[PDB]
């Protein structure tokens, strides 16, 4: 049968032009008063998935 | 390209793309193999450990007897009942790209011309549906194993050739790769040549 | 396409049993035992192609020692003398001469003694 997509992964990763995946940074949901503005500012933009983790992401998203 | 007619001693202008191209062995091989695969009737089956007739009773208790542990009388290790990976009916057909199929035919036809196996005639017919009549005609033309391709399938010719094992009569739309290679000689009528050109283009 | 294994299996077993002829009891009769014996035998033979060379040199040396002492010199000194006299005859040949041509062996000893002097 057709491979099924891990739906949770599909809501967290988006494929880019050259084949990488972008994702949102963690640690920016709650408990924010104690965090410094510099730290929070650097977490706001989207980031790329590291080389070590690409294999896992690709397995979860066969139709990306 | 000019194909000399055997009976008329007159040339017939044909396309160089169809009758003069080089022989691609790898392409022809793939198409020939696919044709044989498409003839297979994959009708067979064996019984797995689930389909063998018998009960699901454990033959003896797990521990206590000095015997190897058993669970089913239908185990593939045991005599009578098993077949670990039992076969099921399957389809062996392969996909041949339309362009690859046509390209193979062009290679085959071109090679036949180089090997002087393609005989082109104006017309090929018998007066009556009599096998004896056809046999004599072929003997006059020094032919035995021959694939005769005609523009229009003549009923008399078809009937006269049924009992000749080494002779096959076909129409232009019926050519297939294996047949062109299998038969020693291929006889084509002028009309058939034209239809083949348009088909292959 | 079911494949029966009988013909091929028989041929393989007979091949091993043919090499086990002469062996004792089950070692020349039963395949399981014969296979182990045939493997072992080959392992010894590989080792012994090397050991054969060691044993024969040892034999030649012992014979040269005896023959030299009959002429009044030890093997160690005899070899040294031949080296100093630039004689390149090997031990296989020396042992052969010591047994078959005792006169020629005496001449070799004298040459060795002269070089040592």
């Amino acid at each position: 049968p057709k491979i099924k997509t891990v739906r949770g992964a599909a809501k967290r990763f988006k494929k880019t032009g050259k084949g990488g995946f972008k994702h949102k940074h963690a640690n920016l949901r709650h408990i924010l008063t104690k965090k410094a503005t510099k730290r929070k500012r650097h977490l706001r933009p989207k980031a790329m998935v590291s080389k070590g983790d690409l294999g896992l992401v690709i397995a979860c998203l066969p139709y990306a | 390209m000019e194909l000399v007619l055997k009976d008329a001693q007159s040339a017939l202008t044909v396309s160089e793309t169809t009758f003069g191209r080089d022989f691609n062995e790898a392409l022809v091989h793939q198409v020939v193999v696919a044709y044989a695969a498409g003839a297979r009737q994959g009708t067979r089956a064996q019984k797995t450990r689930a389909e063998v007739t018998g009960s699901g009773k454990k033959p003896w208790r797990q521990k206590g007897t000095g015997r190897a542990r058993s669970g089913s009388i239908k185990s593939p290790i045991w005599r009578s009942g098993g077949v670990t990976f039992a076969a099921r009916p399957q389809d062996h057909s392969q996909k041949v790209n339309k362009k690859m199929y046509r390209g193979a035919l062009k290679s085959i036809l071109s090679e036949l011309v180089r090997q002087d196996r393609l005989i082109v005639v104006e017309k090929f017919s018998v007066e009556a549906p009599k096998t004896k009549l056809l046999a004599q005609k072929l003997k006059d033309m020094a032919l035995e194993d021959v694939l005769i391709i005609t523009g229009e399938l003549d009923e008399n010719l078809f009937l006269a050739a049924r009992n000749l094992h080494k002779v096959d009569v076909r129409d232009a739309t019926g050519i297939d790769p294996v047949s062109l290679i299998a038969f020693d000689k291929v006889v084509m009528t002028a009309d058939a040549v034209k239809q083949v050109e348009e088909m292959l283009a | 396409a079911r494949v029966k294994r009988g013909v091929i299996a028989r041929a393989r077993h007979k091949k091993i049993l043919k090499q086990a002829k002469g062996y004792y009891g089950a070692r020349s009769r039963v395949y399981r035992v014969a296979f182990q014996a045939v493997i072992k035998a080959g392992q010894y033979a590989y080792r012994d192609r090397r050991q054969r060379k060691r044993q024969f040199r040892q034999l030649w040396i012992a014979r040269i020692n005896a023959a030299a002492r009959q002429n009044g010199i030890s093997y160690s000194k005899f070899i040294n003398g031949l080296k100093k006299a630039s004689v390149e005859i090997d031990r296989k040949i020396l042992a052969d001469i010591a047994v078959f041509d005792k006169v020629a062996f005496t001449a070799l000893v004298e040459k060795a003694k002269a070089a040592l002097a």
Partner: protein, 143 residues
């Protein structure tokens, strides 16, 4: 050229691994699975994304965004496609007739990809600044 003379091209047909068929093969006994463990068992192995019990990457990271639904019915047209409409007037209907976009497409935009060398009249389609220059340079009109 005979049925007992045809050969495949070199490299086209590789053999195939057959496990558990002796020492000489190189895949005998364990058959490439190593010794013991979950991964050596028949039907054994962990599911996709499993990293032990550590919270997996696809659950450690936050979800973001939403699906538009308007994007599904929007398409982009290259300058190369303009010459395939057969008629000289590029509309939503004509593009669909030429099998360039799709029956459900409702909005289309022409972008600077490829080149247009024929006067065309684009009607009812958004055009990028770059594409506009190219079309007008070729002698076309964007209505």
């Amino acid at each position: 050229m005979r049925l007992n003379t045809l050969s495949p091209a070199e490299g086209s047909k590789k053999a195939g691994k057959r496990l558990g068929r002796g020492i000489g093969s190189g895949l005998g006994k364990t058959g490439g699975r190593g010794h013991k463990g979950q991964k050596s068992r028949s039907g054994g192995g962990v599911r996709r994304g499993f990293e032990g019990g550590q919270m997996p990457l696809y659950r450690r990271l936050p979800k973001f965004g939403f699906t538009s639904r308007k994007a599904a019915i929007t398409a982009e047209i290259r300058l190369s496609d303009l010459a395939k409409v057969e008629g000289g007037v590029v509309d939503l209907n004509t593009l669909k007739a030429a099998n360039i976009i799709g029956i459900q497409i409702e909005f289309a935009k022409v972008i600077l990809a490829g080149e247009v060398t024929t006067p065309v009249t684009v009607r009812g389609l958004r055009v990028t600044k770059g594409a506009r220059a190219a079309i007008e340079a070729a002698g076309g009109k964007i209505e």
